[PDB]
Amino acid sequence: KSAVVLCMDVGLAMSHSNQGKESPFEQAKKVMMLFLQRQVFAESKDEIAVVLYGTDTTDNALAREDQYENISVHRHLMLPDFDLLEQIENVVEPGSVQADFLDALIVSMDLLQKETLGKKYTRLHIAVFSDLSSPFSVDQLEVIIANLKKAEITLQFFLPFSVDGPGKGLSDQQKEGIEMVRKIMFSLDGEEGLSEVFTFRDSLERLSI
């Protein structure tokens, strides 16, 4: 079996709807639901956690004043079920704030480190869904990368636009986030990584590999 964290940006920017009929938030939720439905219907043994960042409340093991704020562990590492499906469809809502995606990655890594103790997995996987609209701190990113390598974690980023026609009006902050994603993925996978940025439209199939 494998262990997967879905690390989902639910910050305020994700609710801005100017691409089609579904906002980035609603598109990412739909992908998560289809993925989880596939897993439930197939009776897969993979364990799947859900970490949300950009939530109005804070609920994670690293949270303490001014640290890892606005990040919530919605589902711990366990088999998916219909309660999870019901919550994601009805409970999970857009947040009214923003959070640091590297903080959310650290929470996700800490969850995996603790909750995979004493168990055997073929792969550890973290999938991040975001529009990269909000700032982040790179403090100690070199430690994060070292541990992602040590634990052989596969990291996938999914964005609601292509980063390979007209330009898409990406903010400077989004462009900085994209470059950081590229630096992280290259650190992990080398030259191949520079292109390992995926879109929401391809995310369901890339997840289900």
Binding site: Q67, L102, I106, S137, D139
Partner: peptide, 11 residues
């Protein structure tokens, strides 16, 4: 903005 990593990451 500095952060504090959990000890298992920096041990």
């Amino acid at each position: 903005k500095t952060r504090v990593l959990p000890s298992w990451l920096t041990a």
